[PDB]
Design a protein around this ligand. Structure first.
Ligand code: PRO
Ligand code: PRO
Ligand code: PRO
Ligand code: PRO
Ligand code: PRO
Ligand code: PRO
Ligand code: PRO
Lengths: 543, 546
């Protein structure tokens, strides 16, 4: 017995509670304090390579979306030389980290999760509110609950994976070693969820990888807070490098390294395609075949059958379309309503719309949602509103206003299209812009087909109906129209361990972060066979 | 609050590895195999392309030759033209939704039935066709066309049926369920000559998971590949789920990568071809309805590393088998042997003595044959060039063998070469022939030499360490962690068994998706999660907002 394999244990975890933030609650008090702690503050956030805080001359600012005069962070872009130094230092740390027992790596993430749950909760929530423009509850479900859940559940999944071992038959013993990927992983995270950044960099690190993490410019404050928590929780130097950078510069640099083994990406279709093509162009140089994982957005639907509960349709659609300003890959942006229910649904939507509060989420907890993330987002959304004012098939029913004088404020907008295949029914806006198509009741089946065929995407979707046969039929018809499919619920708000998230078609590679299989993309297994008796003669008896 | 979607209870499956038969005199399997070999003598099968249930011929007629008697055309087949390939795609796509909607257990039943047929009544046929068409000996055919193929079918069925039991957490007011969807589109399966079982798995595993497939089998394994295809159809595989489409390689790749409906390529073959397909997909990335999934197994330059504490006889027997079985035509074959100076007199003497006893000949006529001819004229020519290199290189010396003769079959003697240069080209490049290179290292340089084992080649597939010192084994295991995806301690580098040693490696050796293990099938499903909520949603506002 040259090798001895220690018995793997099990990890019990459950989802983090979502807090209610009632008046006089400990969490509301703590959050109010943490928000006050950020008022008028700018954090100077360096690049971090190993334990070194590095500044370049390429200074950038993160602005508070609802008060863009407030520079919440000053940071800098890593240049090609710094990125390459970061790669070198990470690679030199990788073997030792990869050789650590899975349980020891998991412990770092479990400790981080407990820090986020307790003493650091108010901080990460406040930084997500002030830096990304989230309301209390949007920050809570993201920077606390989802991030905490990724860390705990991925830890559980990874520990359990070590229990997945092959059959051994005497006189040999077989064991699978879940090796990290050889090389480094580039993690490229989006502005819209603090938790996604934590997962994109953290999940590969958990599995024994080293990572260059390029956080989103517009989520820098909260992203660095998560980074610091991981380091304080025991993540060794050079396992995750914190390297904000210009997008093209970062992509060019990591795809030029012979040591690139993975890209973990969430963002646009064109950017993911470009990175895929850069890897293909440089395929000769890489020591192995890099693994690309991409989540690329959606044009998500709520489909209503005449049997639907109208109040649930209304509240679920308002939330899905407008929470966080519709800046979610999962947000409903196309609503299909039968003619027979349209007078009810139109009236209710327009009435509730007039009561939606858009304002400062730190100062007014009555706020439903706040400003969109930045000037570029504001400009894109304004372009779509101008299109809705131009198109003969479109009519703005409510909203349509925007004002960027103080923050990047866009009012929620509800549009009716007479054309089910209008460009606004197809293209992802990432803003609080809901388009409604009213279909004749006797054409529900033809309309279900349009739900499936109209767009290039396959991410989220919901069907509202109280008729079993209709639900069964719609489920079959929409099988590939949504990777996260909902019956009588809104299309947003996937919960780790409950609705693993992702979809195919143009929406990405569908590796389902939030489920037990995601971590498999970040391990390259080795199987070791040890034979305990001498080998026989090389000839066979039949010879 | 009633559940409108109802999910069936999941099942499990008990399977064990298919036992390897002995083929001793007096055994039924030896009798059956001799009859099956006789059934192939002097025969040529005309093998069509199969699209749906239609047998289709083109003008591009090709022949598969028996490697050890190349005057014997064992099969006449044809290459699908681009029109036929596109017709096959269209018909597969039209059949896909129904197949994807079939219960996993019903799809698994096809493969379990096929495995049962291969185990019993069809065993002798598939063995004989692999022997005569690919030049395998009885035992090499047995571990491949029977045991490994049967095991892929049974174990993947188990893995797939049981995968449906992997379900998310539900919390009130909702029920969550994962649907393991097949990929939307079609999968292209491209299989190699050297294992009948690999073709069955490359096409079969995606089909099991609800995909439809264009299977381009290897020209030089056509006879056995079609036998497997027919068995799958007889076992109940519906039409248009696997299209049997031999084709020119570049033509096939061009056609499948030009379709907007391509969702996967399941490939085993050369590094350059896999890279080319990868680049074709990238070039055409705009047109695809989704992002295609490429899986590739691409070969190796595999090592046996010997420490001074090794069991000498094990080193000798294990290395002779790994280097020379099936003429070294395995992605897992040992082609570099590292021996410490202190054991070299013993090991050299033993290797040379045993070498003189290795019989090369006709595997159908002489069951005493250790290995037979290599696969084809191209392989023979490549190997011959490497032998000539070994005679002309100042760093190389041929210790045994070196002869070859292609007058009757593509016959190459087993060859043992010593290199004085651990970085000689012959230590780096995959030959796919019976050519073993030995490097002798001073005992006191074992650590530096382990680093050379790891850094010399571009590959990471298989490797073995022979040693009876625990500290040395632990050290070597750490040092060689990424040098081999299938790593062996005191055993040979070939002969992975499904469910026991899932097979594959990284570096240039491929994407390492570990066929033979429980996770391989995950590459061929794109999961959907359905949440059904059983209570009304309530207001859009939250309590904290009041
Ligand atoms: O069932 C078995 O025998 C192997 C070893 C433990 C888990 N799987
Ligand atoms: O082209 C090659 O040889 C290496 C292998 C992995 C990708 N680059
Ligand atoms: O719309 C844009 O282009 C920028 C980038 C992410 C946030 N907004
Ligand atoms: O379901 C949602 O709303 C978020 C979007 C990214 C992943 N989960
Ligand atoms: O380029 C596009 O838009 C589609 C998305 C998946 C790949 N091709
Ligand atoms: O050596 C070659 O190129 C051919 C292809 C596989 C069989 N022999
Ligand atoms: O290990 C071996 O020898 C074979 C090679 C292909 C897969 N398994």
């Amino acid at each position: 017995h040259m090798l001895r394999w220690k018995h793997t244990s099990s990890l019990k975890v459950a989802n983090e509670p979502i807090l209610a933030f009632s008046q006089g609650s400990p969490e509301r008090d703590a959050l109010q304090k943490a928000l006050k702690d950020l008022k008028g503050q700018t954090e100077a956030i360096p690049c971090v390579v190993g334990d070194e805080e590095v500044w370049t001359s390429d200074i950038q600012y993160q602005l508070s979306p609802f008060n863009h005069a407030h520079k919440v962070a000053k940071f800098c872009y890593a240049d090609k030389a710094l990125l390459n130094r970061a790669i070198d230092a990470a690679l030199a740390a990788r073997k030792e980290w990869d050789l650590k027992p899975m349980a020891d790596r998991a412990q770092v993430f479990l400790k981080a999760a407990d820090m986020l749950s307790g003493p650091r909760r108010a901080e990460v929530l406040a930084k997500t509110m002030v830096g990304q423009g989230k309301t209390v509850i949007q920050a809570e479900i993201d920077a606390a609950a989802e991030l905490i859940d990724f860390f705990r559940f991925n830890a559980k999944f990874a520990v359990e994976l070590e229990g997945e071992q092959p059959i051994s038959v005497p006189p040999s013993t077989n064991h699978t070693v879940y090796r990290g990927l050889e090389g480094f992983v580039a993690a490229i995270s989006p502005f819209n969820f603090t938790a996604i950044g934590g997962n994109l960099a953290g999940a590969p690190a958990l599995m024994g990888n080293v990572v260059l993490w390029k956080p989103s410019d517009t989520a820098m404050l909260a992203s660095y807070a998560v980074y610091r928590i991981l380091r304080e929780a025991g993540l060794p130097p050079n396992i995750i490098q914190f390297v904000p950078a210009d997008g093209p510069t970062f992509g060019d640099t990591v795809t030029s390294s012979e040591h690139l083994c993975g890209i973990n990406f969430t963002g646009s279709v064109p950017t993911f395609k470009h990175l895929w093509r850069q890897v293909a162009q440089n395929l000769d140089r890489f020591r192995t075949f890099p693994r690309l994982a991409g989540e690329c957005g959606g044009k998500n639907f709520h489909f209503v059958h005449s049997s639907a509960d109208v109040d649930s349709v209304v509240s679920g659609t308002l939330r899905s379309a407008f929470e966080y300003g519709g800046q979610k890959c999962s947000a409903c942006s196309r609503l299909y309503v039968p003619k027979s229910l349209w007078p009810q649904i139109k009236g209710r939507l327009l009435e509730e719309h007039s009561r939606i509060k858009v304002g400062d989420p730190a100062e007014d907890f009555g706020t439903f949602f706040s400003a969109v993330i930045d000037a570029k987002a504001f400009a894109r959304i304004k372009k779509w509103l101008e299109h809705a004012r131009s198109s003969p098939s479109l009519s703005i029913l409510a909203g349509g206003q925007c004002n960027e004088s103080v923050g990047y404020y866009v009012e929620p907008c509800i549009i009716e299209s007479k054309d089910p295949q209008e460009p606004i029914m197809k293209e992802e806006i990432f803003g609080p812009v809901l388009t409604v198509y009213v279909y004749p009741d006797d054409k529900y089946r033809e309309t279900l087909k349009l739900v499936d065929s109209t767009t290039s995407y396959g991410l989220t979707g919901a069907v509202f109906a109280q008729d079993k046969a209709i639900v069964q039929e719609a489920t079959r018809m929409l099988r590939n129209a949504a990777g996260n499919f909902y019956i009588n619920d809104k299309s947003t708000g996937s919960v780790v361990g409950q609705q693993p998230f992702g979809g195919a078609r143009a929406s990405g590679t569908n590796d389902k972060p939030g489920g037990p299989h995601y971590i498999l993309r970040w391990t390259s297994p080795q199987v070791i066979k040890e034979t305990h008796k001498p080998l026989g003669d090389w000839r066979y008896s039949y010879m």
